[PDB]
A paper describes a structure:
One enzyme in particular, 2-aminomuconate-6-semialdehyde dehydrogenase (AMSDH), is responsible for oxidizing the unstable metabolic intermediate 2-aminomuconate-6-semialdehyde (2-AMS) to 2-aminomuconate (2-AM). On the basis of sequence alignment, AMSDH is a member of the hydroxymuconic-semialdehyde dehydrogenase (HMSDH) family under the aldehyde dehydrogenase (ALDH) superfamily. The complete AMSDH model includes four polypeptides per asymmetric unit describing one homotetramer. Each monomer of AMSDH contains three domains: a subunit interaction domain, a catalytic domain and an NAD+ binding domain.
Structures of AMSDH in ternary complex with co-substrate NAD+ and its primary substrates were obtained by soaking co-crystallized AMSDH-NAD+ crystals with 2-AMS and 2-HMS, respectively. Extra density that fits with the corresponding substrate molecule was observed in the active site of each subunit. Binding of the primary substrates introduced minimal change to the protein structure; the r.m.s.d. for the superimposed structures of substrate-free with 2-AMS- and 2-HMS-bound ternary complex structures are 0.170 and 0.276 Å, respectively. These two primary substrates bind to AMSDH in an identical fashion, with two arginine residues, Arg120 and Arg464, playing an important role in stabilizing the substrate by forming two sets of bifurcated hydrogen bonds with one of the carboxyl oxygens and the 2-amino or hydroxyl group of 2-AMS or 2-HMS, respectively. The observation of two hydrogen bonds being donated by the active site arginines to the 2-amino group of 2-AMS indicates that in the substrate-bound form, 2-AMS may be in its 2-imine rather than 2-enamine tautomer, as an amino group unlikely to accept two hydrogen bonds. 2-AMS is an unstable compound which decays with a t1/2 of about 9 s at pH 7.5 and 37 °C or 35 s at pH 7.0 and 20 °C. Notably, this is its first reported structure. It appears to be stabilized in the enzyme active site in its imine tautomer by forming two sets of bifurcated hydrogen bonds with Arg120 and Arg464 so that the electrocyclization reaction cannot occur. In the ternary complex structures, Cys302 is located at an ideal position to initiate catalysis, which is the attacking state. In the two ternary complex structures, the distance between the sulfur of Cys302 and the C6 of the substrate is ~3.3 Å. Interestingly, in both substrate-bound structures, Glu268 becomes more flexible and exhibits much weaker electron density and increased side chain B-factors compared with average protein B-factors: 37.8 Å2/28.5 Å2 and 66.37 Å2/39.7 Å2.
Residue numbers in the entry:
A (entry chain A), B (entry chain B), C (entry chain D), D (entry chain C): 18 to 500
């Protein structure tokens, strides 16, 4: 199996390739051709030229129809996209079938519909001469959008950027994660077969530093760079585009908290924290890695979570009641295990997990770790402050509302928080005080695609979702008519 | 000792001072105390802490009321602010009276009012269990806003950032331009006298690199950096805040065009382009330095503009009938003169101006240049592509509408453009094709503070004005309640 | 052929029927069963009950998909709908094919999309105890919407109401005009076949006074009455629902003007006024029956419009170059011809038309009239002030812009106006001074479904279109949470 | 004392007059001149003319500044306004000082501010020839607004209509209630002294049927009638305006419920129901005349409420700790006492009150009644279904959530509801099911002037508040420019 770049309407190979590895068993899935600087340039130039071709003359309604045809194309190959996402990442098949792929299709449909309904503003004004003036605003395409996406929710996060980019009449050069290149390449096929004009959507494979990603960010031809990934990489990209003053939108890390108050529905909180800590094997930027539980219910909470975490099934993506697959890769598992040892060194009690499961089959050649719960660390421990991106949480007691609010907010990140309480006042009082972009009360990762999505502090720059995406991916121009 | 910093509610001197010079005659106006790194830290820390004090507890209505008291405080000292702006910049007194100071007051009133009226969003959604969920958004203060402003419209541009910063509940550390420090110091006294709590507004004086401006951009304590000035500085600042992923908002250079079609009201277009080229001695980022005129009216337009340009009175701010003051400084004047020589070397015809007037009085020790009009340069000439920021324009003929739109858009900048035509279709057809943030038709620099304002390409990052300011200066947080 | 009512999911007959006549030739097309008071009650009760059934449990996404299925169902029978609308009204087949049916389809898709994208408002407030409160708004179904619709654009106007009613989660009882019952009945079949739950959409046939129309209007079980028709009929309905204080939305008559300024594109204005006067044989509420032309071009306009009007082909719906069909009915034609006589009596010059064409075939038993142009009437003549609703216009000269604005506005109606000018300022200066809900400049009846649509004075009550429809067909409820 | 009409900038008497009675003591406060049909016509004509005068040329900023001067003018006579509202209505001085007068002032400031920030829409569209079109909307004054208002919150409700009417550039003819004419007359003096141009605001005194109220509603020169009062009066007005198809906004009766769930904070709910039942002596449309309390806390609630109700001090507006003043008049007291008798006859148990207090002083000639609580009535009793508009409530037990929702909704009215509960899910789940315009959770009559305010069913037609006012009191016109 081979994964090509898609540049200016053609699938093309490159001089260099790399391996796509299945994290379940360590086996080779495919070879991937790495785009060089020359090919990146060729993509950017093609995307510039496509803005002046047929794509550029489509009405908003016709553009929207064509984006719906993209969505239809993915739906028509639904189970192929499921298989590609599962192979790259080891995610449970049921998750790919119910979240990953349908979200990617819904991304396209939501932004196609938003492109149809969206309008702009009219401002009347008086003038000295008494005849007045009119200011009106219009949305135009920004230009070429460079898209660089991560491996944790491959098609979902890729199409989260590509859908609004296209719905706003932009052209795109997109570089998916080297760990999860498959579903993006299938998306290129769907674009091609749906009649998307050449150069509108281009797909380049590769790495970051000294590869496709870097070259993309350095290219003077782009108008914007949208990115999801690690905070440090965000900082690096922000420096890279600075000489062009390119528009930027970043969704970066977090070290998210969950807070369980004494009035919580306890079993529901246990189940919710189980999901918020261990979904996708802890490899969602939204996962809870720090948990604060009121002292009066702390012991019972920890006990209850231990029992649920030990019933989790860790294994094959299509295994009967599977809850967790492996980590994305052996190198990622190295990092996570390194943090597992660090916690023990910082004085953690390992309530459960803390190692790798023994399967006695091919899974032992994969990148699995156990779901892990810690207790006993101070708020300043490295394991409680640095993003681990694995299936782990630390649980700490608290006593007072104002105290726990300060502890959640004592972080250089600020992406998301989940709070558990049955009390009306507390939900709204406490939520508004958490320094994050996204708070859930009595749930986790419930998404309405119209809402603003983003983080604060190190977790983000800007906001996407609904009209924020329509504003980010558009040139907003103001036209003033003196009457 | 004359202009002090204002930090945590006290005027404070510093270890060194620098001279503030009157560009009308080169005389010393005052000594300005240059904030050092420790003082910049103190200000940022004070601004951090003020977010937890009484300022953080004010209702939106009470905050708005206090901002209106700031406005009223400026108004109460109106003629002092006029004299300060005039002294620093040499602006004609009638212009500081009618444009600069009143706009600064209007900035505070508008954003105070937007703060009281602005609301957020409610999204209802269905869930699996049939009970639904609610997502709602709220605006909160972003944090500490660092404000770095230019010398060309000192109080106007400084308050354009400070007013929405404060209206959104933030605290501020603001660094005015070293060339025009006086009005911003008076503003500090107004804040003090209105009872703004300590730490909420802090003024620091100094330069950029290795001085107060650079220190502010590098401080990890700010949440955002808003800047107006040269594109090159914008790039430097973007790199500096990168490691912190600070929110950024930039209004940068342009090389703006005016276009005059054959069906323009010729007299009105001549007067309009005279204003657009020579207002504030050509020192507005919105000024036209490139003018394109349909060949049928080219000679008449040029002849007319020469006549009107040579009637401009260049002189004292309180001189009878004065139209233009000096440039901001001798250093700026040397840069503009360096372009006046370069234009001649690149082959220009000097229609008028091209040097410095000879006053035979103390004005010869100031920083005056003549209003200049060039003809005969090619589109790739440096004087037609690089921002000069003086009272100059090049006039070129054109023949076809698609041609002139290409020539307007063939620029690394994209701030603003002015079009002159009486034809309904052409106005709207042409305006939407110009790749800028702001187009005026049959006028120039008509401002409605509700409109989105900014540039594209090198001319900017983001938008401000109306709801775009309210969104930039706020954290937008989404709270999701499972029902 | 017989046309049944559709009540609670079943097609049902009634004790009485009335004839549906083809206005082309006077032949019987079908018998239509008239709903009595008991059946209207049954439809209302069914509609009330369906709000408590499955319909009321659908998510907005699922409701929207069902409404898209209605639209697809129309599209799948597109040519049957075309044939139906043509048979009832005599409209040219190509007009039914390009305007009427595609717009009915688009009505459904537009409002389905709006239902998915629309959201409500979140208002935060401070309280005396310092804890604050939240106000959030929600859109709920208003309840049972009664829809009464006219014969001039039967399916388009019927669906213009039914689509947002359904999209907002309401149930409907709809009474189409007795002159054009066929396409509505067909729509009831599409509804049935698409699986719309019983009682959600009910169709009742009949007349107004002393019939289905009036009974619907009097039923205490409805929550709103939306209506398009004669202003006098609006007034009657407003009286009828007053005791229940029902929500009302009315789009009523007009006596619309076109204004042609001296700088108009003359041949384009001639063609535009031809269309605005004689489309659908002048039977559109938006038609121009008053035309004002600048004195300097009056004679040449009148001359040119005469020639174009006499080239119109008046004939069979599928006849080769056909432009106009008959009037809707003999009764309407009696009324139009009465005005034709009145005009001559009031002193008109008949420039063209003024009678009935003579075909010497079966069309002579239909309801045809000639396209007619008058001159020479004063502004007070009844033929110039009262709505005729036939293919007629009166042309008068003017000299001065303010004068013609006054003469346009001197009316008890205020639906629409069309202005012809090539001048940028005039277009905007004049448009804003016309006291109507809709102005077109250099075009007529160009529709964007997001815009507010409606009239002033006797021409309307309320606005519909875009968010205006979403607000009218919803209960907007405010919920205030003390924190 | 005499109260004059204010018509075209002059105070004028009439041929007929009526007595304004102080309800504390039955003494004559003033004689009021009753406008006749000719005076009403004179006011409407003057309002129509003033739309073409200096008022119509004000910029939105200058109009807003003039509206703020009206507000300032009220504030400068603050104690006079307080004395006037007290004299007319008997309302406690403390509450006129803190609710009534301050709210009237805030109505003007809020709508003045909205007027300055409000803007309209721009819609871009494709056309067949590829050139496109623009639709933009503008807000214009609707015309002459007729304002008819009730006696319960005289200045607050009067200004709630007058402020947005004026802020939207309309002119006004206003008829305050015959029972509370004083503060409105004072307001005409403030308008006059603030320099409001003659004819912009006209005040006419009189009654409803066969008097100034009716004459206004029949006058063909008005563009809109906004009304607050009894439902049956709304129905009558809606018939009166029907032949002109005038725009109408009605805020009408309610029979509002409060619901106290078992998990409510009990003492807070008692205090809250006390306020919601007996504020302004129960003469607020928003008052709770029906209370439902969960069975498990019913007896304890009734007992607590009994105690609080008997601690209320009923007496002079300026008496020490007065809580309640008299009813508005003797005629209204006769109606309320009639209901107090009916309740006994319907089987009610009188927990407290039920008659009139005994003062043995001039208050015996007033219109006082006692705070009254009933128990024991069925859901169909007249006293539980009909609006009494006095200081009374009936308390009833309930068992189940769905049950109480059905019972609250089982009404021909639908204005407001208050719910008491500490539970997050319950609050949001139950609130959205209550068929009213306004739900308060854990509070009552908490007002944010931006929110939509209105009722459903017999309780109203339309919404006012924030943008809903700006939309009602403006003509929204759509201008379509073909490019
Ligand atoms: N887009 C707009 O709206 C707009 C408006 C006005 C001015 N401008 C641009 O502003 C320029 C005005 O000139 P200027 O010479 O004041 O610009 P500048 O960029 O040299 O200086 C602007 C400010 O930045 C500070 N500064 C300079 N170097 C810095 C550094 N390394 N770190 C941090 N702060 C630093 C300065 O002290 C000053 O306060 C022109 O380019 C003009 O077009 C743009
Ligand atoms: N927002 C609301 O829903 C709201 C608010 C406050 C009061 N109210 C209602 O107010 C009522 C108490 O007020 P009210 O007794 O003053 O009501 P009312 O209806 O008898 O009269 C109110 C106003 O209407 C005038 N009026 C009476 N009959 C008229 C007619 N035929 N034509 C024209 N005008 C006429 C009166 O002179 C007075 O100015 C209660 O029903 C209460 O629910 C409703
Ligand atoms: N649903 C989403 C999950 C995202 C995680 C990081 O963005 C999203 O981003 O849209
Ligand atoms: N505060 C208010 C009370 C209104 C009661 C009836 O309208 C209001 O209307 O603003
Ligand atoms: Na992989
Ligand atoms: Na200076
Ligand atoms: Na018919
Ligand atoms: Na009275």
């Amino acid at each position: 199996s081979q994964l090509l770049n898609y540049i200016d309407g053609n699938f093309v190979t490159s001089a260099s390739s790399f391996a796509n590895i299945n994290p379940v068993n360590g086996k080779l899935i495919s070879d991937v051709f790495e785009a060089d600087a020359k090919q990146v340039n060729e993509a950017v130039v093609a995307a510039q030229n496509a803005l002046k071709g047929p794509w550029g003359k489509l009405s908003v309604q016709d553009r929207a129809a064509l984006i719906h045809k993209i969505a239809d194309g993915i739906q028509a190959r639904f189970e192929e996209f499921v298989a590609a996402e599962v192979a790259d990442t080891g995610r449970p098949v049921h998750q790919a079938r119910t979240l990953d792929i349908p979200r990617a299709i819904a991304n396209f449909r939501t932004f196609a519909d938003l492109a149809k309904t969206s309008h702009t503003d009219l401002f009347e004004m008086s003038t000295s001469d008494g005849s007045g003036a009119l200011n009106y605003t219009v949305r135009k395409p920004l230009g070429v959008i460079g898209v660089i996406s991560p491996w944790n929710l491959p098609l979902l996060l890729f199409t989260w950027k590509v859908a609004p980019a296209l719905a706003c009449g932009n052209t795109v050069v997109a570089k998916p994660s080297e760990e999860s290149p498959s579903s993006a390449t299938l998306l290129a096929e769907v674009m091609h077969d749906a009649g998307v004009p050449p150069g509108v959507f281009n797909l380049i494979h590769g790495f970051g530093k000294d590869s496709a990603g870097e070259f993309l960010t350095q290219h003077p031809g782009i108008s914007a760079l949208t990115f999801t990934g690690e905070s440090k990489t965000g900082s690096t990209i922000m420096k890279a585009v600075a000489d062009g003053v390119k528009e930027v939108s970043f969704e970066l890390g977090g070290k998210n908290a969950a807070v369980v108050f004494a009035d919580a529905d306890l079993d529901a909180a246990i189940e919710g924290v189980l999901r918020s800590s261990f979904t996708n094997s802890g490899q969602v930027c939204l996962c809870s890695e720090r948990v604060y539980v009121h002292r009066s219910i702390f012991d019972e909470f920890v006990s209850g979570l231990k029992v649920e975490a030990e019933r989790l099934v860790v294994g094959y993506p299509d295994q009967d009641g599977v809850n967790m697959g492996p980590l994305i890769s052996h190198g990622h598992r190295d990092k996570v295990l390194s943090y597992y040892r660090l916690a023990v060194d910082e004085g953690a009690t390992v309530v459960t997990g803390g190692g790798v499961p023994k399967f006695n089959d091919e899974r032992d050649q994969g990148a699995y770790v156990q779901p892990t719960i810690w207790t006993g660390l101070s708020d300043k421990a490295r394991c409680v402050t640095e993003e681990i991106f694995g299936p782990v949480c630390h649980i700490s007691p608290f006593d007072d509302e104002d105290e726990v609010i300060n502890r959640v907010n004592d972080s250089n990140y600020g992406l998301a928080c989940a709070i558990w309480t049955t009390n009306l006042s507390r939900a709204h009082r406490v939520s508004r005080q958490i320094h994050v972009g996204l708070v859930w009360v009595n749930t986790w990762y419930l998404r309405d695609l119209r809402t603003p999505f983003g983080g604060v502090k190190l977790s983000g720059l800007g906001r996407e979702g609904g009209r924020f995406s329509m504003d980010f991916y558009s040139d907003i121009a103001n036209i003033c008519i003196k009457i």
